[PDB]
Write an enzyme that holds these catalytic residues in place. Structure first.
Site: not given
Ligand SMILES: Nc1ncnc2c1ncn2[C@@H]1O[C@H](COP(=O)(O)OP(=O)(O)O)[C@@H](O)[C@H]1O
Ligand SMILES: CCOc1ccc([C@@H](C)N)cc1
Ligand SMILES: [Mg+2]
Ligand SMILES: [Mg+2]
Length: 265
Positions: A17, A36, A85-87, A130, A134-135
């Site tokens: 969003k 982000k 941190e990159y996932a 939340d 998606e999270n």
């Protein structure tokens, strides 16, 4: 300290969003991470400055292998940048789209990882509020990590901010705007366990108004293929009365979890 000039930007990792998230590499160290991006105008318009502040404060101080790290932030008068941190294995959302349904071993393992992470959060009276696919992101060994702490708070709490999108993962007390606590995350854990095994969440409906009705009445049914152990755990978590929902230690020691999970408490 940090600025945009310190980074080479690469491909888009995902969209939210507010968040527009990119792969990036820090120039001096070659360290790979996720950036982000938030637009200040959109933040101010929606009035969610306090949520951004919470995300940074809460997530930067937590340290757990099943929680995504936030390293810092900077800004430049149109945008705010959170350094994450990159996932590398992406979202659980994407993984469910790919496979349609998870088997019991996969599901029980993800639930164990989620319960470990939440137990850590709750010991600081931090509630996420939340939790949804998606999270939930995936590390290099396929291990689950909770992300997106924008809605997180300290319990007990009311709600001061408008609900945005889907009601699918929220308990009765939060959709009705009532007082709430840690038990909200236990309800979401039940919704996830069901969606992982079945392929869709249990109160899914065609309109907001009908979804609301199904949640407040706790109206759900199981497909035949869902086993008795899974039904028992899910029925225990999806209780209208929050005080009847189990503790995380009880989830972690449920017979179905222990029989099927490939990871320990
Ligand atoms: N650290 C990360 N590594 C890989 N992908 C990410 C990472 N953070 C976010 N994403 C992707 O970007 C999307 C939006 O990120 P999120 O932090 O959830 O933004 P919003 O607060 O707007 O929901 C995620 O659903 C995911 O697809
Ligand atoms: C943790 C930092 O929080 C911030 C919140 C808002 C803004 C912008 C919109 N004025 C900058 C930083
Ligand atoms: Mg998100
Ligand atoms: Mg957010």
């Amino acid at each position: 300290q940090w600025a945009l000039e310190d980074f080479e930007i690469g491909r888009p990792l995902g969209k939210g969003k507010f968040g527009n998230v990119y792969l990036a590499r820090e120039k001096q160290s070659k360290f790979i991470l996720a950036l982000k991006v938030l637009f200040k105008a959109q933040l101010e318009k929606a009035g969610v400055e306090h949520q951004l502040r919470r995300e940074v404060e809460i997530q930067s101080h937590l340290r757990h292998p099943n929680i995504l790290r936030l390293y810092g932030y900077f800004h430049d008068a149109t945008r705010v940048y959170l350094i994450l941190e990159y996932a590398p294995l992406g979202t659980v959302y994407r993984e469910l789209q790919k496979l349609s349904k998870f088997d019991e071993q996969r599901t029980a393992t993800y639930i164990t990882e989620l319960a470990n992470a939440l137990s850590y959060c709750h010991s600081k009276r931090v509630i996420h509020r939340d939790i949804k696919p998606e999270n939930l992101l995936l590390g290099s060994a396929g291990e689950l990590k909770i992300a997106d702490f924008g809605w997180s708070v300290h319990a007990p709490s009311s709600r001061r901010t408008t609900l945005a999108g889907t009601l699918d993962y929220l308990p009765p007390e939060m959709i009705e705007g009532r007082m709430h606590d840690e038990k909200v995350d236990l309800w979401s854990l039940g919704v996830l366990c069901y969606e992982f095994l079945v392929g869709k969440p249990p109160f899914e409906a065609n309109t907001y108004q009908e979804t609301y009705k199904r949640i407040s009445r706790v109206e759900f049914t199981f497909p035949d293929f869902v086993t008795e152990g899974a039904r028992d755990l899910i029925s225990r978590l999806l209780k209208h009365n929050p005080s009847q929902r189990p503790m995380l230690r009880e989830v972690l020691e449920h017979p179905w979890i222990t029989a099927n999970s490939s990871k320990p408490s």
